[PDB]
Ligand binder design. Structure first.
Ligand SMILES: O=C(O)CCCCCOc1ccccc1CN(Cc1ccccc1)C(=O)c1ccc(-c2ccoc2)cc1
Ligand SMILES: CCCCCCCO[C@@H]1O[C@H](CO)[C@@H](O)[C@H](O)[C@H]1O
Length: 257
């Protein structure tokens, strides 16, 4: 029954997300490279890319920041459907579901989208483009500061060489976390989390027989993710207060409220 539990989560993962890690890493090993202002313009013109649907133009750094919001908001949508495809998550009261998503999605995003990252940059536009790390570093503060930490985490995370089956359970564990503030039914969520963590350890034993310390290594990554997101939240607060011309998607406003 724990097998059926784990297999259901994996199916939900495949159904609700666009690109698997399998696809992502095969591409990275060709997409149009965005490495400067000109190539960014060319990408927006047709070689890669809802530019007309974005907020009014302000500047290059802010424009990229808007493209960042596009992807995260899209990933939150997918994560929500993925979570809702899990029976134990859907059996929670709706307000608890929102609490878990609110405090869980960014942890899940940074872990899950590590797949589309290497040391040189990351995939964009469903894998049609590749934006260099150097270009993102070249953006002005605070936009370059909010980006770089994710690369450091991603490359270290990708070194564990998880596959999509591992990630499905790992992301589920992140969302179903009993530590989120304001949770109504903590014991129920804690119990679900424990079950997923048990399923994960069991899965890792079979899928990575030679991989020692892999499960405790992943528990440490969950701790790292909490720190990453906390720092990220702090930087988003700085942008909210100091970048008046920079708008924020309403959904993200609610998350950082
Ligand atoms: O708080 C929020 O949700 C919105 C505020 C996010 C601000 C920080 O966003 C990023 C920071 C570091 C890396 C990547 C991203 C954004 N992401 C998600 C991500 C996150 C972590 C790992 C991997 C992918 C992107 O996928 C991405 C999309 C488009 C571009 C782009 C377009 C044209 O030029 C550049 C660049 C990146
Ligand atoms: C779509 C799933 C992800 C949604 C994440 C956004 C959650 O925002 C929160 O929504 C609650 C209303 O339900 C409010 O009470 C909180 O003040 C607000 O912060």
């Amino acid at each position: 029954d724990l097998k059926a539990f784990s297999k259901h989560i994996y199916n939900a993962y495949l159904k609700n997300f666009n690109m698997t890690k399998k696809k992502a890493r095969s591409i990275l090993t060709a997409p149009f490279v965005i490495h400067d202002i000109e190539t960014l313009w060319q990408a927006e013109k047709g070689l890669v890319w809802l530019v007309n649907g974005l907020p009014p133009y302000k500047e290059i750094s802010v424009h990229v920041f808007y493209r960042c919001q596009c992807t995260t908001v899209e990933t939150v949508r997918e994560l929500t459907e993925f979570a809702k495809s899990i029976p134990s998550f859907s059996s929670l009261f709706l307000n608890d579901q929102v609490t878990l998503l609110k405090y869980g999605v960014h942890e899940a995003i940074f872990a899950m989208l590590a797949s589309i990252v290497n040391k040189d940059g990351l995939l964009v536009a469903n894998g049609s483009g590749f934006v260099t790390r150097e270009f993102l570093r070249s953006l002005r503060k605070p936009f370059s500061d909010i980006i770089e930490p994710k690369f450091e985490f991603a490359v270290k995370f990708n070194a564990l060489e998880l596959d999509d089956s591992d990630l499905a359970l790992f992301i589920a564990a992140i969302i179903l976390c009993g530590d989120r503030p304001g949770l109504m039914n903590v014991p129920r969520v804690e119990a679900i989390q424990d079950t997923i963590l048990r399923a994960l350890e069991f899965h890792l034993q079979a899928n990575h027989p030679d991989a020692q310390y892999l499960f405790p290594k992943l528990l440490q990554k969950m701790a790292d993710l909490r720190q990453l997101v906390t720092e990220h939240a702090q930087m988003m607060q700085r942008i909210k207060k100091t970048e008046t011309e920079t708008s924020l998607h309403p959904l993200l406003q609610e998350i950082y409220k």
